[PDB]
Structure 1
């Protein structure tokens, strides 16, 4: 009865949620209409007097045809057809459009639904927020949502898998306006922000899985694997179970540092997992490598500060402790002095379940890593540089200020981002 609610915002949030809830209906035996010993669907699914397991979540977007495609696709009878929230007009890749006009007209309907979902739940542990970090819906409407559920619901755990925009390649043109302004609001009202990119999983889909022309659907599976590896300590039994507030209180040391970084270790193809020995040393040592990390940033440039290793499957604590020891005595993995322990272990009892005909395979043991590093200041100084170039031109402000938002909010979007970089450099220094 230890449910945590998942809230998905924007096209990116709903599309990675389709992969996230395919697997949920896959791993727990849930045939895709709603019906069907151990385990706990009550953590993520519902019940009724007809055996049906309602996916207790909310998908909200300002684009009608994506949700309409969900209502006409495969999961029609699965999802309950008024907890999928949609609007008639999109934000059109704008912050203020999704913040002061479109957000106001649709937020009361969203908050009504999350009331009647929290009332049936007696063990509400926390919130999963799947939003695009540089879009229109995921930047504006997320900010209203964070403003409202952080005040009304008090002190609950709020974990978000923000879709961080890729550093080199990008889809939008107004991305640093949307990105900086949404992490201003969500800086003080979040507990951990797990950044993922899109170019990196495209690389992993190429070099590790031997299938070319990767699409977004082949990407959201690895996002779905990570969320499943995180949440299955509650869905399933394990040797050393790790609940949801462990990441909340045991990974971040200061209130304005909560920007950890995710990595899924055993990426491998179907023609290679019958064909290779999974070993506990080979899986967690390759997880520390910079080349297979879900945001393009070198952790060798920074220092690790806290880490959390989630193991899942045929894994013994000793092989965890032996492999985590040889990482500790390695010189090239630069580690902070004032946080000398810096590690967490979570054990689950299952192989990760594999999507039908996908690019992954039935690995018997998996490692998920959630580590926060001061090297991510390099990723945010690049967006600092891109904001400086585009705001000195006075470029494309009239779309933002002409929609109710005061131009001066562009200013405090930056000096707090200056201090947040400054706070990352000061925690970034050795003490002696």
Structure 2
């Protein structure tokens, strides 16, 4: 057993982190006080769930997590929330002045003041690890902290933990729930600086999550809470292989191996099904064939885009619940005939499949119905580059007039970093294009 440390940065990262850790406790039978009745390994153990939880001599299971924000408002709710006893106080790090939606304020001005403290608190968790695998980093592209501080931390993690994998769960900006007009700037700045330091990044477009909540959960105007419970279900599907017994994606290194054959194209598309409202009195349970087929519907993807017009480089299906391999292959065979699934010719046309027999767990009183079987598909498709295209365009409109650039230059950033980051993105869109035509 090798440990994983989760790092949650800024408002989006912290609030999503809370949703995930609440769901993790429910899945593993850990109560808000951190007690786990079924762990007979008291004070320790090299069990699968110990990848994400440490144990006290007193039997408390404590997340291997650190929450960092440049203002206290959001983490203060964790300090006084349902799971406050869960986290050690040193794990919740707070500033006083946030980044003001400004990547350069998070990365240079305010970030340089708190980076050493954060890395010492991280070092403290690493020191309780017998073999550290690496990090899971949650943040927004658009926030000043989520973008600017995260990229500073990713650089230092590469220096201080050279051999360790770093994965990202990243919130791509959507106008329906965005808070700043400069989110396109912060996104390109944090993608450019972070690209080399990340081995695998799962993007979640808030536009996709929002529509899924409206369409399938009948929420008139979703809140962050609605989005984050849905997002935490997807994150839980992705990390389940790290926390449970099994033979697929058992360490962070396997995520790169299975999903990222070329290093810069390391943004797998996540597709999740079925999403069913808790309000539906009568729901006909969906079969393996139906939930699998739903994995090829753009309406169920974490990023709206069209995989029929890209090429695949890898594809994993992560099932939870009443699923047997025969139903999966039967479902795949018919789906192959009926859908446009084109692989790059230098990769085999195939699916890596993981099945966990425990069906998805749902937060009591949430919006998701309990279902008998669910699946998260992770495909590395060039189609996800549509999202880069959209963002680079918005960036280009504002930057052509240098609108708002003075707020970044005023924090000590140079204008040249904008065009350098924008050039990197240009090479990225070109990489995806060469691989996809």
TM range (shorter): over 0.9
Distance in 1 between the 2:132 and 2:334 partners?
38
Distance in 1 between the 2:298 and 2:271 partners?
10
For structure 1, which segment, 223-232 or 132-141, has the greater mean C-alpha deviation from structure 2 after superposition? 223-232
Structure in which a larger fraction of residues adopt strand: 2
For structure 1, which segment, 147-156 or 230-239, has the greater mean C-alpha deviation from structure 2 after superposition? 230-239
For structure 1, which segment, 333-342 or 119-128, has the greater mean C-alpha deviation from structure 2 after superposition? 333-342
Distance in 1 between the 2:240 and 2:282 partners?
24
Alignment partner, residue 25 of structure 1: 25
Deviation of 1:242 (Å): 4.2
Distance in 2 between the 1:242 and 1:30 partners?
22
Contact 1:241–1:348 (CA<8 Å) still a contact in 2? no
The answer on 1:390 being equivalent to 2:398 is: yes
The structure-2 alpha-carbon separation of the partners of 1:152 and 1:39, relative to structure 1 and needing over 3 Å to count, comes to: closer
The structure-2 alpha-carbon separation of the partners of 1:58 and 1:241, relative to structure 1 and needing over 3 Å to count, comes to: closer
Deviation of 1:169 (Å): 6.8
Deviation of 1:209 (Å): 2.0
TM-score normalized with structure 2 length: 0.93
Contact 2:308–2:342 (CA<8 Å) still a contact in 1? yes
Distance in 2 between the 1:54 and 1:186 partners?
29
Distance in 2 between the 1:122 and 1:21 partners?
22
The residue matched to 2:74 in structure 1 has which SS?
helix
Residue ranges of structure 2 left out of the alignment (5+ in a row): 37-44
Deviation of 1:407 (Å): 1.4
For structure 1, which segment, 2-11 or 32-41, has the greater mean C-alpha deviation from structure 2 after superposition? 32-41
Distance in 2 between the 1:273 and 1:263 partners?
25
The residue matched to 2:23 in structure 1 has which SS?
helix
TM-score normalized with structure 1 length: 0.94
The structure-2 alpha-carbon separation of the partners of 1:211 and 1:416, relative to structure 1 and needing over 3 Å to count, comes to: closer
The residue matched to 1:131 in structure 2 has which SS?
strand
Deviation of 1:259 (Å): 1.4
Contact 2:55–2:61 (CA<8 Å) still a contact in 1? yes
Deviation of 1:39 (Å): 6.5
Deviation of 1:274 (Å): 6.4
Deviation of 1:421 (Å): 1.1
Contact 2:137–2:166 (CA<8 Å) still a contact in 1? yes
Deviation of 1:195 (Å): 0.7
For structure 1, which segment, 313-322 or 57-66, has the greater mean C-alpha deviation from structure 2 after superposition? 313-322
Deviation of 1:55 (Å): 1.6
Q: Deviations over 1:195-234 (max 9, x none)?
A: 1022222222222123433211111111111121122223
The structure-2 alpha-carbon separation of the partners of 1:216 and 1:50, relative to structure 1 and needing over 3 Å to count, comes to: same
The RMSD of aligned alpha carbons is 2.1
Q: Deviations over 1:246-301 (max 9, x none)?
A: 22211112111111111211111235486313311111111111122111222233
Distance in 1 between the 2:266 and 2:193 partners?
14
Distance in 2 between the 1:38 and 1:244 partners?
17
Alignment partner, residue 9 of structure 1: 9
Contact 2:344–2:435 (CA<8 Å) still a contact in 1? no
The structure-2 alpha-carbon separation of the partners of 1:105 and 1:206, relative to structure 1 and needing over 3 Å to count, comes to: same
The residue matched to 1:6 in structure 2 has which SS?
strand
Count of matched residue pairs: 429
Distance in 2 between the 1:375 and 1:2 partners?
34
Q: Deviations over 1:71-128 (max 9, x none)?
A: 1222222211111011011000001101112111111111111111111111322211
For structure 1, which segment, 387-396 or 136-145, has the greater mean C-alpha deviation from structure 2 after superposition? 387-396
Contact 1:240–1:348 (CA<8 Å) still a contact in 2? no
The residue matched to 1:343 in structure 2 has which SS?
strand
Matching of residues 130-279 of structure 1 within 5 Å: 130-166=138-174, 170-238=178-246, 242-272=250-280, 275-279=283-287
Q: Deviations over 1:387-407 (max 9, x none)?
A: 221111121111111111111
The structure-2 alpha-carbon separation of the partners of 1:351 and 1:150, relative to structure 1 and needing over 3 Å to count, comes to: same
Q: Deviations over 1:314-349 (max 9, x none)?
A: 211111222222223334344433323242111212
Q: Which runs of 4+ in 1 moved over 6 A?
A: none
